[PDB]
């Protein structure tokens, strides 16, 4: 197997960076 069914967040890196922005948008004024 070449890590086909065992991928943590290699392709979700850009997605994680977007999740952090969503949390700041919920608390951008405080």
Curated annotation (Swiss-Prot):
| Membrane topology type | Single-pass type IV membrane protein
Q: How is it modified after translation?
A: The N-terminus is phosphorylated by host PRK2/PKN2.
Show the catalytic activity.
RNA(n) + a ribonucleoside 5'-triphosphate = RNA(n+1) + diphosphate
Q: Where in the cell is it found?
A: Host cytoplasm; Host endoplasmic reticulum membrane
Q: In what way is its activity controlled?
A: Activity is up-regulated by PRK2/PKN2-mediated phosphorylation.
Which stretches are transmembrane?
A: 10-30
Give cofactor(s), names only.
Answer: Mg(2+)
Signal sequence span per UniProt? none
Explain how, and how many, cofactor molecules are bound: Binds 2 magnesium ion that constitute a dinuclear catalytic metal center.
Known partners and oligomeric status: Homooligomer. Interacts with non-structural protein 5A. Interacts with host VAPB. Interacts with host PRK2/PKN2. Interacts with host HNRNPA1 and SEPT6; these interactions facilitate the viral replication. Part of the replication complex composed of NS2, NS3, NS4A, NS4B, NS5A and the RNA-directed RNA polymerase embedded in an ER-derived membranous web.
Q: Sum up the protein's function in the record's words.
A: RNA-dependent RNA polymerase that performs primer-template recognition and RNA synthesis during viral replication. Initiates RNA transcription/replication at a flavin adenine dinucleotide (FAD), resulting in a 5'- FAD cap on viral RNAs. In this way, recognition of viral 5' RNA by host pattern recognition receptors can be bypassed, thereby evading activation of antiviral pathways.
What is this protein's record name?
RNA-directed RNA polymerase
Residues shown, of full length: 2982 to 3011 of 3011
């Amino acid at each position: 197997h070449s890590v086909s069914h065992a991928r943590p967040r290699w392709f979700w890196f850009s997605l994680l960076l977007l999740a952090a922005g969503v949390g700041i948008y919920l608390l951008p004024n405080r």
